[PDB]
């Protein structure tokens with residue numbers, strides 16, 4: 096349906112030539128892509144194409160149009176004095192056709208390998224890497240939250256290294272993202288069972304379990320379960336993933352028994368001291384409360400050591 100050599104036209108008039116299909120990402124097929132004007136030998140762009148009616152690409156497109164502006168991001172980076180922000184570049188979008196049916200596509204920045212492929216036994220990472228990933232994610236979280244959105248699906252499969260830079264990590268899918276504060280108006284707290292248990296069950300927030308519209312605290316919470324999983328190689332609810340209520344109950348039990356619940360869970364020699372503190376910080380937020388990003392980062396980097404290379408020596 097999208098053979099190598101297919102020419103796609105974006106809304107800005109630019110043309111893109113499809114290369115090899117490198118996989119599926121989110122609710123899309125991912126292809127290497129080249130501009131028709133001065134292409135490099137090695138692709139620096141991808142085309143994300145929908146393969147189904149409706150889908151979350153429209154929602155993801157709107158997220159990029161609203162918060163992922165090159166200009167705005169660079170200005171943010173300048174003001175916050177960051178080396179980089181783990182959000183891929185958006186290049187354009189449009190429609191492509193196959194057998195009289197239209198499909199939405201987006202042209203995105205080509206990234207490197209996803210974190211699931213370079214993990215140690217049962218999807219683990221070195222303690223130092225785990226903490227740096229959290230910090231990078233918090234920076235991304237701070238930016239999108241300031242721009243009225245919450246992610247709702249942070250997991251190793253959604254984290255990829257930079258194409259040219261292996262010491263940079265990117266959160267690469269925003270299909271489940273949500274506008275929690277449209278025009279500066281935070282959503283009210285309201286539970287809804289019929290809209291409950293969304294997201295990746297292993298990592299989804301308790302708010303998600305209860306059918307509550309996602310807010311900033313849910314994002315921080317997910318990041319916390321993520322880090323515990325990356326450092327320990329399992330979660331107390333690993334054998335209960337097919338029962339969402341059992342997972343919710345186990346998450347409530349973990350948070351209610353903090354910090355000893357997390358402090359005992361860790362494997363010997365690699366403490367969950369920072370992560371327990373992080374979770375304590377994360378679980379103390381009110382529903383509409385802005386997270387203390389700076390305080391969370393200091394919990395993950397208590398000695399203020401500069402962020403260096405990402406160590407993936409257990410792969």
Ligand SMILES: CC(C)CCN1c2nc(Nc3cc(F)c(O)c(F)c3)ncc2N(C)C(=O)[C@@H]1C
Pocket residue numbers: 117118119120121123125141143183184203204205206207208209252253254255267268269
């Ligand atoms: C969708 C993710 C979770 C997985 C997609 N993904 C890659 N995506 C990109 N760029 C990309 C793709 C997207 F959909 C984006 O929205 C985006 F902002 C950037 N480069 C390289 C890869 N590589 C090598 C992979 O292994 C897989 C296929």
